[PDB]
Design a protein around this ligand. Sequence first.
Ligand code: ZN
Lengths: 142, 47, 140, 168, 183, 344
Amino acid sequence: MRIINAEGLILGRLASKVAKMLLEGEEVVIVNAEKAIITGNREDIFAKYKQRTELRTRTNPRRGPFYPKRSDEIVRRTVRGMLPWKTDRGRKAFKRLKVYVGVPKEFEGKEFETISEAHMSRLATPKYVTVGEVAKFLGGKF
Amino acid sequence: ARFPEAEARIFRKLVCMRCGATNPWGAKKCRKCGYKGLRPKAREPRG
Amino acid sequence: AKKGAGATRGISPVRPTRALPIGAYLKVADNSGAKVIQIIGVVGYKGTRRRLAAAGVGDMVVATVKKGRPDMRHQVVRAVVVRQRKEYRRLDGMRVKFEDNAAAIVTPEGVPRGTEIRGAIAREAAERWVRLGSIASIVL
Amino acid sequence: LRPAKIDRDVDKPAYTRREYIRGAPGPKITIFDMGNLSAEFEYEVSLHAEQAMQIRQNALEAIRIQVNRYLQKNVGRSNYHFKIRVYPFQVLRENPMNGMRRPFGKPIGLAARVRKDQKILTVWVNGQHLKFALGAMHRAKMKLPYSAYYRIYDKEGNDVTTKVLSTM
Amino acid sequence: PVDAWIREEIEIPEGVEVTVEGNTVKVKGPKGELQRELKYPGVQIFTEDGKVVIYKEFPRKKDVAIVRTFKAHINNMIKGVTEGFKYRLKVVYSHFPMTVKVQGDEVVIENFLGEKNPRRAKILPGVTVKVKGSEIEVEGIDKEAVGQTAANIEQATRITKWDRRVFQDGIYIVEKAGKPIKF
Amino acid sequence: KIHRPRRGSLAYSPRKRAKSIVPRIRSWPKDSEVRMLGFAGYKAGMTHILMIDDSPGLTKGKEIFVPVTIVEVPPLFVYGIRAYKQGYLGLETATEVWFHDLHKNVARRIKTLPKNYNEEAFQAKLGQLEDLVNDGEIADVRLLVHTQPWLIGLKKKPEVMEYAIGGDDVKAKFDYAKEKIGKELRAGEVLHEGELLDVIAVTKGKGTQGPVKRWGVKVQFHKAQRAGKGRHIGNLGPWHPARVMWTVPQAGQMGFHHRTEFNKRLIAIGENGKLVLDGNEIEITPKGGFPHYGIVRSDFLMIEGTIPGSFKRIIRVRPAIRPPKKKPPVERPQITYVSRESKQ
RNA sequence: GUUACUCCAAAGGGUGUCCCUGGCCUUAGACAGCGG
RNA sequence: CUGGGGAUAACAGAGUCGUCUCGGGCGAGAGCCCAUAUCGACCCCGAGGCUUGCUACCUCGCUGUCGGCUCUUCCCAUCCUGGCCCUGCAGCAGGGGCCAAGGGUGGGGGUGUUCACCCAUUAAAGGGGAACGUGAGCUGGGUUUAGACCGUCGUGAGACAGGUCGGAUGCUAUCUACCGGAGGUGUUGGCCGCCUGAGGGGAAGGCUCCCCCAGUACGAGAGGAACAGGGAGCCGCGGCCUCUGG
RNA sequence: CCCGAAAACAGGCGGCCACCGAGGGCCCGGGAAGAAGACCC
Ligand SMILES: [Zn+2]
């Protein structure tokens, strides 16, 4: 499997590249997911993700959009949105993915990778927020 | 009951006659509505 | 303090049970022109859908005069309950009850009308309104 | 009365012949000239329309009264000449209900039709009342169904609005 | 693009030592250190010949503003380690004389308008409060620290329920670092 | 329109039979006193006393009426120590040590007990645990406990549970545990007289019930009573949304729910079935015994008020997790009378 | 904003920012401070 | 009565918005004087789709209905409850505006009523949507059959969007949905016991009165507050049977 | 506070069997539980 360090990276571009990988048949691990950035303004982003959390099915909430509050799950969910989820192909591609907060010991002592196309260096604007900030706002653990 | 020390810090304010909002002392237009009509906070009973 | 030398109110520790709802006819125990009254409301009560207001001993009620002397009938008054037929617990656990349902007519601010209560009255009424015990020659 | 968006637009034939229209109303505005009529003033100040409009006589009389009061108290009669250029000939129609059986409007009012870049009003004034002239024009512009713009013409009929604005 | 290459210098005095280290300016002087963080894309900060230089190589309006802003902040830090900043407040009362006390990191005001509950205003690290009669001093070495302390003490005594033309008692700012306050 | 609050609470849903008869404690309080944070027993009955009020509020200093629930608590046996570490999401078990000589009746619950397991191996495993706890990979320590019903004659099959210990540290906890394993705990060594407790248990069964009794729905008008719809509700909902919502009152299981109750004062802890008032020694068991429960033999607690469950049921108490700011004192209140008369 | 059209808001306003034009000022101008 | 019609109305839907509800620009003038505390004319510009109309796109045997009772949920253009700003705000209060939809918003009299009117209380007793929410949930007062009476109209048979008395209420749930209860397979060996807790639900609590502060600040007097502290109850929620009633 | 290893990364620990037999069900006497099933002694 390939190991990718989200640290200084942009979420959507990271996810686009990773999803193409997954479909072309690889295994991907993402570490330090709390350290990716989201671009925009803080009020806008928080409003978006709160409005998403408070969506649910009025008749039975044991159904319902289960939109997450943790950082690793935020990342995993973006990637999912970038795949065909209603198809065996997509379900297998998605099962070939794993996302972690931090760097577990299991992966410690190994050389990571970084996607060129996604990186904070491209930016010209001091306006960015972190996924960990979003998670703290929403009430998630780490 | 006079306390110039207190008047200088309670009554250096402007009020927009449109939205009612409070603006600083040297303003030329309101910072919310853009109205150009600003009056000072009444420091002595009018009426 | 502000004004306590001459007052009209007080505190009871018991809070009896609420047994007399709206529409109930009470006898008048005081020596005012009134003989019978009907409860039309209860002061200091808020409720819910389809519930009636109910009062017990020590509670003040807005009432109508049904029987009595001509200058008192079809008038709206305020009255304090002093007796009830339904039981109610005292602190030591013993329970207490009376023989009928009676009231005294008073002013909307506690001062009573009349000058003598014919009969006994409950202790909680007299603890809560301090000018009633000054009238009745039996307090229990 | 009924809103002016119903009568703003021009996409409809002209209806100006009283020797065929039965029940045609009569004008409200009957005064179109004010101030010193015999006069040789310096600066001319006129509203032009930014697009085709259809202006009611209610609005014209409102404008007249407001502007004339303002200039009478701020300028004085011997120093201004005020003119309204357009007369209301267009008859307005309303359907009297029956529903939409026999729909053809009975007349209710009048309007003036005005095309793009046409003049509506004019205040002739000296050089030391221009502030008041332009305030009057603001007041008038505020009471029309579509937008408008002003110029400042010289005798010899030339545009001097820029040279005048820059210096006052 | 208003200009090409805006740059502004700051003359460094004798006993002061300025140094930059990774977008963090550090100033040492006869009393105390002061560090701060001044970050903006395309803005550099360095020392050429005894100066502090701030530079931007094709500014718009909102870059010019930021550059002059950083200038002001670094001047503040220099003058602060070199002289310090001092603030004054005044106390006024019609009825109900109140008492102001310091204890640790708070300022306790008791009997303000006859209240049975005191009012607590926070002091910040590096700032010293000092009561002398009806006049108060707040001295310190960081402009923002001293201002926030003074402002906390003043806001401690705020009214929202009655006319302030008749109810005027409280504690008020009268000099914000040497400059008076008039109306 | 007319407004009223809805019928019932949505906070105790799904209203379903409990996963187990032995209750479950999900959260534990912040105590500094290094001690076990709870005890367990079996419920016996109710009665009443008269006491001088110690608690804040008028009625303080007077003789009042207080109902009381008696909870029979024989000692516990400590048989285990269990360590926890931190994983990706939360805590996870790390190691266990058991005692070697356990009663013959514990295999009525845990059929598969170990075979050789002598003291040699017990002490070696203890040592391993200690050398692990002195490293740093440890987050908290807990005790494993079982009840002994054979003492009061109630049953033989025991109950097994896991309790926590007070303190911010783990080596003090380990010292406490290592001292306590292999022996018995009595309630006086753990609980104080006057504490506030939270009681935790499983309520009585009522069965399948209707919405009138299960949610508080109002009975319908007498014409509907004569139509066949009195104890029914009217509407399962509107036309759109075109499904039934989960908030609409329906029939189903009533009772046998896992409940908790806050702030019940412990008044008295007794020894061998007798209460020693200031003056003289006295018994608590009434004339003719307790209905549906016999005589009290071992040890017992007086608890102010009511608690959830039927008589012979297992209860679990813990020190209050949600106490007020105005607490009553920790000392046995002045008791003037205790009722020994027949309760049947 | 990411809408050819099917399916999408105004009059009135803005030292928000980027640009065109034309007057008046300027080796002491337009703010400040020191005084008349 | 037959044969047929959504080629064509009443009823709810769609479309539209003159009317309707809720707003805005400008500044005449009124406010001791003072255009903007408050009011804002005449004229001009709009939102919503909760009134009513216009049209006739769906449905002429699907169901045709008004009000009430029961039950769940939503919007904010906020009536009280929390927090603030202006005043022609001394205090007690009032008027006008900003954030805020967590909780609450009740009982009765005549009338079939909805609304409207009235009583006594209350912290206050907001307005709307859900096929004018809800008849495989009830009722059945009104309205539109068949009987009969009066008044008007008509030569008459007879009619009245005029009044009055009386006048049928069906179902064994096929599929889904919801409340609760069980049995399997899977989790790459099987079985005991004990724990973690991803996630989901929650109003589990909301409000009022009394003492004191204090007859104090404020105020010419009349009158008359607030922070802190102590206590009690109403509505709602979850449990128990020692005491009292059935 | 209530539900909650079908949480598809479909968990962690301890112990007992398997590579005859660990455990479980029926059955018997009863209820603290109950429409059948389940649950408890
Ligand atoms: Zn404004």
